[PDB]
């Protein structure tokens with residue numbers, strides 16, 4: 133049930149000592165990563181988010197405004213070019229405000245939701261690395277919301293609704309929520325920290341979410357709501373995070389023209405639902421034990437022949453299935469039929485299509501699943517329509533179960 | 534007609550001194566970038582390519598083993614972690630071999646086409662940077678093909694066919710081709726360069742492509758076919774590149790089991806159709822002068838109302854168009870209709886939908902475009918149906934236009 137074993141077991145990814153804590157995404161594993169992007173982007177469109185991309189390193193002088201350099205430079209990778217030092221970004225927060233700073237902003241642009249699949253890098257000790265859970269290079273479904281102090285309620289509520297919306301897709305309904313308060317090493321005034329912590333607390337009571345305080349576990353600049361999901365083994369996994377920031381936008385000279393035609397500093401809301409997408413894939417790998425849902429399966433359908441007589445028929449079906457948007461692979465090897473089914477069952481392919489000579493009239497296929505179920509013969513167009521409903525709805529369970 | 538100058542007007546991107554030669558992709562520009570990615574991925578599926586992803590840096594010890602460290606030490610960024618050097622990758626070729634190296638490969642796995650949108654970094658001089666044309670961090674539509682020497686066609690013609698097939702979508706068929714031969718400082722025996730240069734030379738005569746030699750301009754490991762396209766201003770732009778490599782796979786301990794059950798070294802073919810996608814977007818920006826085709830437009834349709842009476846009707850239309858897969862924005866601001874139309878016309882939005890009281894009764898919409906042309910009032914379903922017809926085929930030209 134170990135994702136490292138399943139990942140090697142399913143051709144998902146690999147790692148080696150030349151790049152410690154960094155993922156070599158294979159074709160099958162990268163398909164799952166891209167499928168998660170499509171799912172996230174569908175939510176971004178639904179929740180009216182922009183999608184941007186920032187540069188991969190920046191001047192240390194910029195990281196100096198934020199105080200990020202003071203707290204965690206030891207965790208930061210560094211490079212120099214023409215007597216200037218640059219830091220490979222561990223977070224997308226200052227990159228997003230720079231985009232916000234371009235062009236004069238007004239209150240009519242707020243709330244401004246800006247998201248990015250930012251690939252970050254943190255210099256973690258090699259002894260702390262373990263599979264996809266703890267890595268040096270990871271990708272966040274990061275987003276930062278710029279809004280006025282009157283829009284704080286509505287925007288934080290939208291982030292909370294998004295957390296439960298996406299977690300329910302993967303079947304994670306046991307969620308533990310914690311409020312991380314101020315740490316001993318922080319920046320910002322006491323009264324700022326009071327308002328930010330209270331606002332996060334109020335947002336949770338409005339949505340009727342029980343939670344407990346976690347003293348000293350917040351960021352040095354913002355308190356954060358931490359979402360923890362429980363898998364089918366009742367194991368805690370901390371993925372979600374919503375922070376309320378009144379500090380950084382002021383430090384990075386971010387401003388907008390208000391309703392009263394005056395200088396105001398915008399409130400920034402950090403959010404990340406899945407957290408590290410490499411980590412989230414590892415959670416999904418262990419949660420399903422490699423039995424990914426059909427919409428996430430690297431190979432969704434495998435069509436196999438019994439003899440060479442159906443090799444022409446199988447290739448036609450493989451092309452027809454591929455044209456319908458289904459990830460389908462053809463198994464034309466000269467191996468016994470029980471041998472083929474066992475191999476692809478171990479590959480956790482959701483459906484296996486069997487084509488004998490009895491199939492060659494009928495325009496039909498013998499369907500069997502990775503669970504060992506037999507579904508019998510009927511229409512190829514019917515299975516296409518049956519399947520397409522399954523991927524488009526991102527259903528957790530398969531056909532006839 | 535300058536891309537940097539249009540790019541500021543259209544919310545495409547921006548750059549600043551904190552990250553010289555690196556792009557801050559804004560929402561509108563990133564839409565074009567992703568929009569090109571889908572087009573490339575459609576070709577990868579068509580031409581049977583895998584898609585992988587490599588880490589951002591690797592142990593320098595490998596960059597010695599390839600010879601890249603000796604030749605291009607000044608152009609590579611370097612960082613430190615636990616008394617070990619890592620280099621932010623300037624190329625994706627050896628990262629692809631690592632994926633190929635995992636698991637024993639045979640001749641039945643060949644040809645193996647592996648593609649990646651690899652984000653590279655080269656330390657180019659800062660006085661040398663200019664907009665999107667010359668950048669420090671760029672994304673290549675890279676791919677490397679592993680095959681036997683008898684397959685040295687079937688892949689090279691596929692690369693050549695892909696070059697002209699993808700260029701025709703953007704309207705580039707004025708293409709001049711050059712063949713770069715061996716430089717004095719290279720690796721491999723002379724007999725490789727005789728076969729490798731000849732293999733590329735015959736392939737161009739094979740495809741009825743006139744070409745000129747560029748003596749001494751090839752890489753230290755491979756001769757290269759260079760594709761140069763000309764825009765509407767008859768300006769040369771060098772984007773395509775196909776390399777024939779017999780050296781590095783041997784240097785990186787890549788091997789496969791042949792038909793005679795003996796270890797063999799696979800041939801590697803470097804290819805890049807668009808080259809740096811940041812550069813290609815800048816070329817496209819200048820080629821169309823900001824008038825991107827509908828399938829490439831960041832915002833495809835803007836629906837505007839005249840008064841608040843049509844505010845419900847436009848919102849229904851925005852949802853219907855958005856559900857149809859059209860990037861649509863609704864303009865409900867309290868401004869005059871002539872003010873709204875002018876703003877989006879300067880934004881080069883392909884189509885603008887106007888809804889008066891006469892539109893909401895009749896169930897139709899008034900459409901007329903960024904160039905000033907009228908389609909009059911047309912059926913709402915008709916406008917959707919034609920648009921999908923326009924986007925799906927990636928047509929260069931407009932609607933009756």
Ligand SMILES: O=C(N[C@@H]1C(=O)O[C@@H]1Cc1ccc([N+](=O)[O-])cc1)c1cccc(O)c1O
Pocket residue numbers: 223224225254264265266267268270274275351373374375402403404407408411
């Ligand atoms: O703060 C954030 N998140 C934690 C933080 O900091 O680390 C937390 C996230 C994390 C993920 C993966 C790995 N990993 O090595 O696999 C380590 C750490 C954060 C949250 C939302 C938006 C933002 O813009 C953030 O910055």
Ligand SMILES: O=C(N[C@@H]1C(=O)O[C@@H]1Cc1ccc([N+](=O)[O-])cc1)c1cccc(O)c1O
Pocket residue numbers: 624625626665666667668671673675676771772773774775803804805807808809812
């Ligand atoms: O050679 C290659 N491709 C051209 C080449 O060289 O430049 C061409 C592509 C390009 C254009 C612009 C910029 N840029 O800095 O904006 C960078 C790169 C190449 C092809 C395949 C694999 C490789 O490993 C390569 O190296």
Ligand SMILES: [Zn+2]
Pocket residue numbers: 223224225276402403
């Ligand atoms: Zn943040």
Ligand SMILES: [Zn+2]
Pocket residue numbers: 624625626675677803804
């Ligand atoms: Zn290459």
